[PDB]
C-alpha cells in the first residue's frame, strides 16, 4: 500500500485553556493564584472545559451580572450589526466591566464549533480602540481591534453559533475583585 497509520490518543490543549484563564483572573500583580498550592491542574487526565462549571463556582468565579449596556451589546451581537453606535456601546461596556469587575474570562465555541475555548480580556484603551487579550493558545498577550473582539463575542452570544453544551459560554469575572480608587493631587 504505502499506507502506515498508527492509532494513538489525541489531546487538545483547547481543553486546558480554562485553567490558564482562571489563573489570569484569580491572580494579582503578576504572581500566580495563591490557592494553587486534583485533576484540575493536569495536562493529561485533567478536567475538560465542558466540565469546569462547579469548579469555577468554587473559585468564586461568576458570570457578569445583567445590565443595560450588556443587553444592548447582546442585541447588536444577535443582529450582526457593527457601526459607530455599537462600537461606542462596546467601549462603554468593556470599560465599565474592566473598571468594576476586573479582567473577564470569555468562554466561547471555537470557530467552526469543535471545542470550547477560554481567553481573557485584560485591558482596554479608548485612545487606539484596542482590547488587551490573554489567549493561552497564543505565544503571548496581544492587543486586538474592537471588531476582532466583537467577532469573538459573536460566537458566544449569537444564536447561530450556540447549542446545548454552550450554556457554559459567556463572560465571567473574579467575584472577589474590588477596584482601587486612586487620588491625584492636581
Author numbering: 21 to 32, 41 to 65, 72 to 220
The study reports:
Based on this information we have prepared two deletion mutants GtgE(17–214, Δ33–40, C45S) and GtgE(17–214, Δ59–68, C45S). Expression and purification of these mutants resulted in high yields of both constructs, suggesting that the mutations did not disrupt the structure. Both mutants were screened for crystallization, and the GtgE(17–214, Δ33–40, C45S) mutant produced large crystals diffracting to high resolution. Our structure of GtgE shows that the enzyme has a papain-like fold, composed of a slightly bent seven-stranded ß-sheet with two ¶-helices on the convex side and three on the concave side. Asp169 is located at the end of strand ß5 and Ser45 (cysteine in the wild type enzyme) is near the N-terminus of helix α1. Thus the N-terminal ~20 residues complete the papain fold of the neighboring molecule, which in turn donates this segment back to the first molecule. Comparison with papain and other papain-like enzymes suggests that helix α1 in GtgE is longer by one turn on the N-terminal end and starts four residues earlier. This additional turn of the helix enters the area corresponding to the classic substrate-binding site of papain-like enzymes and partially blocks it.
GtgE is encoded within the Gifsy-2 lambdoid prophage. GtgE is a cysteine protease and contains a Cys-His-Asp catalytic triad. The critical base was identified as His151, the nucleophile as Cys45 and the third residue as Asp169.
